[PDB]
Amino acid sequence: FDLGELKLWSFWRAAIAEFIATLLFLYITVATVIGHSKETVVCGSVGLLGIAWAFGGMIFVLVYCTAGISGGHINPAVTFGLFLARKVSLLRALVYMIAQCLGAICGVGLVKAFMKGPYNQFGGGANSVALGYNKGTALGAEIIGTFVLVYTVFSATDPKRSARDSHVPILAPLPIGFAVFMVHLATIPITGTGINPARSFGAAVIFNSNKVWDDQWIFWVGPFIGAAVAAAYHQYVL
Amino acid sequence: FFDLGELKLWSFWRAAIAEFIATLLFLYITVATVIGHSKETVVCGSVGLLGIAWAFGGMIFVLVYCTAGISGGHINPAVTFGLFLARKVSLLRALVYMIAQCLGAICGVGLVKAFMKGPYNQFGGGANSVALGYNKGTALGAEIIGTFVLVYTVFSATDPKRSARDSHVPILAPLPIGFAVFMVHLATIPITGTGINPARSFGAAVIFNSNKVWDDQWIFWVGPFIGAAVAAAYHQYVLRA
Amino acid sequence: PPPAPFFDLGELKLWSFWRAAIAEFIATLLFLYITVATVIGHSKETVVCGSVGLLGIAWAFGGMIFVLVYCTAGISGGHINPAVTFGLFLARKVSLLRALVYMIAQCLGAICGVGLVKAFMKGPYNQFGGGANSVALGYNKGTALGAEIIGTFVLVYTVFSATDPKRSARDSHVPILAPLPIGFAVFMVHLATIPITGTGINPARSFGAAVIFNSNKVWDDQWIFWVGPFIGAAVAAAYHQYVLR
Amino acid sequence: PFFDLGELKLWSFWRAAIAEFIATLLFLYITVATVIGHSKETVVCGSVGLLGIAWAFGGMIFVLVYCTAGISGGHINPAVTFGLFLARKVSLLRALVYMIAQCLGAICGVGLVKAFMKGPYNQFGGGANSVALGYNKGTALGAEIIGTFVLVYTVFSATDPKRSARDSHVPILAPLPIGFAVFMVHLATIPITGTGINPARSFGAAVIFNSNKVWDDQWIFWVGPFIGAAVAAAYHQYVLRAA
Ligand SMILES: [Hg+2]
Ligand SMILES: [Hg+2]
Ligand SMILES: [Hg+2]
Ligand SMILES: [Hg+2]
Ligand SMILES: [Hg+2]
Ligand SMILES: [Hg+2]
Ligand SMILES: [Hg+2]
Ligand SMILES: [Hg+2]
Ligand SMILES: [Hg+2]
Ligand SMILES: [Hg+2]
Ligand SMILES: [Hg+2]
Ligand SMILES: [Hg+2]
């Protein structure tokens, strides 16, 4: 809690990027999920594969656009893990998780505004365990999946160069984006997308469903527990 | 600005021929993919919307890679406009590019019609318009926010140090830009078609020539230009100290 | 670099010259195999959307191209395509000797790769077009020729735009290439051209297929797949050398 | 030299094997889970398609190898290790340790899938490789020898020359091409045997799924890849690659 950062000008820009990023990340991804679901014709949409690209591809573009500014996180769990590694200050982190949180809700909120009809009607792009999977699994998938995301993140951090005015490493976007893409190609059937507390959170809010809200804890505990293990594995044993 | 001193430069007429030819191939490959997909009788026998998304984002990547060193690689009126507002492109240059791009599009699109007039007219001619189930206000919303993703990336992709030939127009990273065109398409095709191109929407509107299309055509210019503006401002005024 | 004297048998004597040939042979053998095997696997599929679909095919072609140019860039210059060669020849980046040997290699290569797939699955191989280019119903020969010309232009123009000014292949003046852009160029063009004749843009890839499949209907249209890419090749070359860089 | 009694004694040496173990583990978890999720799908086109599966396999390799080059040299594959061993770039000791780690990482990954979705997992081929109806075991072996050649020849072509891993004198590999190799081969071999080119990946799926029909053909995915890996090695080391 070195409150000296708040005073820096750059620090406020970094939060603004993370907010807009996540706003963007959530709008594009979720708008895509829906555009799929509302499709009447067979193979007439982009498909679950299309969705998967949306998620890892946006991440890639975003981490690219904001790497040099905030360090391109767009994910609480990504911040959390980098925090446990102490490459981010307690002050910075809590500010980030908030901006991503507010980022998501506006991102998802925006879509519902463009297509409220099919929005509510088709899941509203809200994470929740799928028929045939116990919560025990949904959490397992979520944990291990986020381990892949974060472990990539650490492996893709520039050791020398850091975010403008800070000791927060530059993230090489391509591997991270792909990692996201991959984890989506496997976890979608389980509980759609995840490994992103702010993504699920932003979705649960604008959708508003007890069923949704009930499983919502998994998408916070899993991503965070994974990010934890990841940091551990990468620093304590590598 | 208005420095007519450029017109006289030999490099200036190339960066325009490139943008012209670049945008011609762009519309040809993409629109051709669109028709090709639509005329498909076999279910799941085409490349699908996912295929079309790639044809766009993909062409942008390639076309920008090819022409970045020469014209700076814009291929998009809204991308030029945004940098123009950033004062990284003269007003004189901008107006030329823009004419060559709209001029490139119309030929590119018209070449697809020449290839297969039959299924071309029959399946939308690859022109943007508002999809049933959406209000013109939303189409414009998606168009703005869509283009904000494209141009904000163009800004995030500019090269600080080196530039184009004969100018101070930055070389652009091709991949992040292509992926952006791609991403935006995956989410906007259901609504309008992923316009985020004026020159692209114009070329096909011109060649398809449908009133229903010409009607919504105004959104595809206003939306992009607005998005690009807000992007420029966001990158320049809000970010970049 | 100086324009390499037009016919200097002198390279024949070079050990690296023959290596580059082989690399180009084997590369086209793998190119055709991985791709044509993919095409077949898609056609033989009984289940709706049980194959990889056309997008899957489009990738096979762009993808392998990417991978192959990467793997051979420093050994032969990464051509894998008579039309790319011919195009690099007109700009005098490649001697008339290498260009002719490369060409012979790519075909011999193409004919093996395909033949090797037919050897893996003869039934469906023959039952589903043999992975050969030909004009699709509802498209007149002239459009076929146009698509191929224009398509190849896209491929070649990118090759030129991908060549490295200060980095060349091993023991040669031939320019080294950036495989990713080139790969994508091939990918893109297929997405647009498959519906038409195929994604040709490869005299060798078309020839090897026609050879092993061997159909009158195929052999009839085959000429398009040579003239189209070359003309396209030439124009990109002229475009890049003459009206630009 | 060869035996190298001293490799065991190094602290980095053990680190690598771990990476390789965690690596191969993830790989199988992510791919296999994708395969199942696809198969157990009820809706038509409701899944990611075989294309997604192919991507899963190539993409994972890409990513995984990007995370493990500097540490272990990013093999994640016996065939790749074997091929790199024949090129004397990986000692006999490190090759044996690597393969165990890769086999042990594999089964865990596959098992981890089963545990999550035992139901559809057993009902849909368990994601293990086997010759499919219509193809003769001979073709399966060729497609597997030829498909691995593509993989190993790329690994060899991605090989960095003036750079190595952390403390081992083992080459860092450029990830993207390799992943695409894996992606491509998958696109052409899946319909035949689902594109193995990975002893570790095949073995682990045969272990966890436990089927005779499967164990029957299980020799193809061991004999093939290694033969491919070796041929590649000979093409690249001997008949090519000089200055
Ligand atoms: Hg939060
Ligand atoms: Hg908000
Ligand atoms: Hg990873
Ligand atoms: Hg214009
Ligand atoms: Hg025109
Ligand atoms: Hg962006
Ligand atoms: Hg030939
Ligand atoms: Hg042959
Ligand atoms: Hg091009
Ligand atoms: Hg083993
Ligand atoms: Hg195990
Ligand atoms: Hg290769």
Side-chain angles (χ1 to χ4, degrees), chain B residues 24-46:
Chain B
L24 177 154
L25 299 158
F26 178 53
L27 276 288
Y28 167 65
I29 295 300
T30 62
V31 167
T33 289
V34 158
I35 303 299
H37 159 72
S38 317
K39 59 178 294 278
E40 181 61 47
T41 61
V42 188
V43 192
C44 304
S46 65

Side-chain angles (χ1 to χ4, degrees), chain D residues 108-156:
Chain D
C108 272
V110 182
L112 189 66
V113 181
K114 187 169 183 178
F116 287 22
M117 54 202 97
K118 191 182 182 180
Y121 174 94
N122 279 301
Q123 182 178 178
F124 301 113
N129 305 117
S130 69
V131 189
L133 288 74
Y135 302 97
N136 44 320
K137 288 168 146 291
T139 297
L141 184 65
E144 283 293 316
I145 284 179
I146 202 286
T148 313
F149 176 82
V150 178
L151 173 47
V152 176
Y153 169 30
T154 298
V155 171
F156 274 117

Side-chain angles (χ1 to χ4, degrees), chain D residues 74-93:
Chain D
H75 291 200
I76 339 296
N77 186 307
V80 176
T81 296
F82 178 63
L84 287 178
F85 150 43
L86 301 180
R88 270 193 175 75
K89 302 211 162 190
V90 168
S91 51
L92 169 49
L93 201 59

